[PDB]
Structures are given as C-alpha cells and as structure tokens.
C-alpha cells in the first residue's frame, strides 16, 4: 500500500 | 533473507500541457507489482504481478483513490516549487518521491524511507530517525519549516512503521529465488583482450575481477528476460593467457566462480 502524503511542499 | 517495499512516484510538467502526468510504481523486493499512470485511458492502480489479482475490489478502489490524491498533491507542490525557485512559465519540471520500508530476515522493520527530488536533485528527505528532515537548498527551507510546524514527520513515521510493514508482510505471503551467473571468457585480437562474461543472473548486483594481484567493464544491463548481463576485460600479452583469472561474485553462488581463458 502506498503512502498518501500530508502537507504539500 | 531481507525484504523491502518501495513506491517510486513521478510528476512531470511540460510547457503547454494543462496538467502534469503523474506515475506511481510499487515494488516488492525490487520487482514491480502495482502501477498507476494518469495518462492511461482509465487511470487506476493495476496489478503488475499475477499474485496481486487476488486482492478484492476494496484494495483497488482505495489505492486508486489515494493515487488521485497524490496526483493533486504533486500538482499543487509543483506550483509551489515554481514560486520558491523564482522559475517562470514555459519550462519543464519534475518532482519525484521514493518511499517504503526495509525488513531484515526476521521480517522486522530495519529502515523507513521518504525522500523527494525536484528537477532530479535532492529536495527534502526524512532522516532515518523518522523525526527530523534534511533539506539542503534555501528554497527547501520553506517546506522544511512548513512540515515541522505541521507534524508531518509523525504521520510519515506511522505509515512507515505500520501500514508499510503490515502490507509488505501480507504481500510476501501472497508472493510465495536468486538465479546464479553462468560465466565464461572470450578472446579478442586487441596483445589480446580477455572478456569475462556473466549471464543469466538475478539480482543485478555483481562483481567481476581480473588477476595474483588485483580493466574495462560495462554497466549491468537487463537481458530483457528478467535476468542481467555484465562483462569485464583486460589487455593481455599473447601466450600469457593462463596467467590471468576472472572471479565472479554473486549472492546466488555457493562461493565465487573462478575462470580463465580455455
């Protein structure tokens, strides 16, 4: 399963 | 032996292109097992190994929806970076991510990974402690500070120690070998050239040496059939062929292979 990123850059 | 999972993700902007193309590829022990490409007719995560077809429709729906979230993430981040680097419209831009987990042979977490690159260069990476960030560039500090203030590290840590380990465990049961190199030497009329070939091996990692005392080579290359090739050569006086031996070192060998021109 993939990570779903948190805060954008 | 040891195990790993990685997801490699790319987002690429081009000058006119309304939106960027996003690609996510998943690996278990360095073999591709899932893939998502926003260019596809029906964009969604597809199995890439027959052992993945066994996942129910919940899997593919949740994973596909996550990937759409990433596409947007990468889209917004690509805009932010443009501003951070005082870049203007009209260029091509790349944002990349690697993330996943390393397990030991005991199947315990050895190391989480979380790193990003902009224009193919290191941008920001989560340190091995899974708490602190490294970010070389001045532009990168806007992100580092943003991500420290938001507590993102804790959330990436939770995924890395939990979900990543957990689903890799699952995949590894569902997915249930090193191919050894066959070696030989060739002879070419350079003073002559001795070429030690290595073929039919997996994984790609390998060393070839020439000897007594400790040379041209090529980079390891895919045969196209899942296996890898490599060779190594030296220039050698005539008749003085047998005075030179090639050693091949590969993890699938009981011990290193020793060969000479015959």
């Amino acid at each position: 399963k993939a990570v779903a990123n948190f805060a954008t850059m | 032996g040891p195990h790993s999972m990685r997801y490699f993700e790319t987002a690429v902007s081009r000058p006119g292109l309304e939106e960027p193309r996003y690609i996510s590829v998943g690996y278990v022990d360095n073999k591709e097992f899932v893939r998502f490409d926003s260019d596809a007719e029906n964009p969604r995560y597809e199995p890439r190994a027959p052992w993945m077809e066994q996942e129910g429709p919940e899997y593919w729906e949740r994973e596909t929806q996550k990937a759409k979230g990433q596409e947007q993430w990468f889209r917004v981040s690509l805009r932010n970076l443009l501003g951070y680097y005082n870049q203007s419209a009209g260029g091509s831009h790349t944002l990349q991510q690697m993330s996943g987990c390393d397990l030991g042979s005991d199947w315990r977490l050895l190391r989480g990974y979380l790193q990003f690159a902009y224009e193919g260069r290191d941008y920001i990476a989560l340190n091995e402690d899974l708490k602190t960030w490294t970010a070389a560039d001045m532009a990168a500090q806007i992100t580092r500070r943003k991500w420290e203030q938001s507590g993102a590290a804790e959330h990436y840590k939770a995924y890395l120690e939990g979900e990543c380990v957990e689903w890799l465990h699952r995949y590894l049961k569902n997915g249930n070998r090193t191919d050894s190199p066959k070696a030989h030497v060739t002879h070419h009329p350079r003073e002559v050239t001795l070429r030690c070939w290595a073929l039919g091996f997996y994984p790609a990692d390998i060393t070839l040496t020439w000897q007594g005392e400790e040379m041209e080579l090529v980079e390891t290359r895919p045969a196209g059939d899942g296996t890898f090739q490599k060779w190594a050569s030296v220039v050698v006086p005539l008749g003085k062929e047998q005075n030179y031996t090639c050693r091949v070192y590969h993890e699938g060998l009981p011990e290193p292979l020793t060969l000479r021109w015959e």
Binding site: - | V12, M98, E119, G120, L199, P222, G224
Partner: protein, 99 residues
C-alpha cells in the same frame, strides 16, 4: 539540469547469424525524462520497436529499455539513435557483437 544518456546496444542471447534474437537498446542515467529512441537496420528504422515503461534509479536519474526482434547477418549493421535535451545532436551507437 540535464544528465546525458548512457547507451548500450546488445543482444539478449549470444549472437549467431541467421538465428532469431532480440536487440536491446538500454538508455540510462538521463534527465529530464522526455527522450526519443530509434533503432536502425542498415540505416533504416526498425518498425515494431518495443519500449519498456520508463523508471528511475535511486539517484533519481531515468532509465528505459528499447528492444526489437532482429536476425543478425554477417553484413547487417544495427544502431540505436537517441535524441535528448542534453545533447545538441542525436547520439548514435552501433551494435558490436562482441560487447
């Protein structure tokens, strides 16, 4: 910043005239990811050239494998021609059966 493609041209199985084989053009270590790869037979484009999905390495550089069905006569010359932003002119490399 661009990284210039490294190119290798080689066959899947040890080379033998008249007998079917696969010719590979392996292009690594390049950026950005847009690239054009042609395979050539005695100067002429080969029609059905299979292209692997582009991937990237741990150093963030991109790689890709082009391959094609080919039969290697004693007289035929095979090349791979790569066009990429890092190179002002397309780069051509010739198949050498011994490498």
């Amino acid at each position: 910043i661009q990284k210039t493609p490294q190119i290798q041209v080689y066959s899947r199985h040890p080379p033998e005239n008249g007998k079917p084989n696969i010719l590979n053009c392996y292009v690594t270590q390049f950026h950005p990811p847009h690239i054009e790869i042609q395979m050539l037979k005695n100067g002429k484009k080969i029609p059905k050239v299979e292209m692997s999905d582009m991937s990237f390495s741990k150093d963030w550089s991109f790689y890709i494998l082009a391959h094609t069905e080919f039969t290697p006569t004693e007289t035929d010359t095979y090349a791979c021609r790569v066009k990429h932003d890092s190179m002002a002119e397309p780069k051509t490399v010739y198949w050498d059966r011994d490498m």
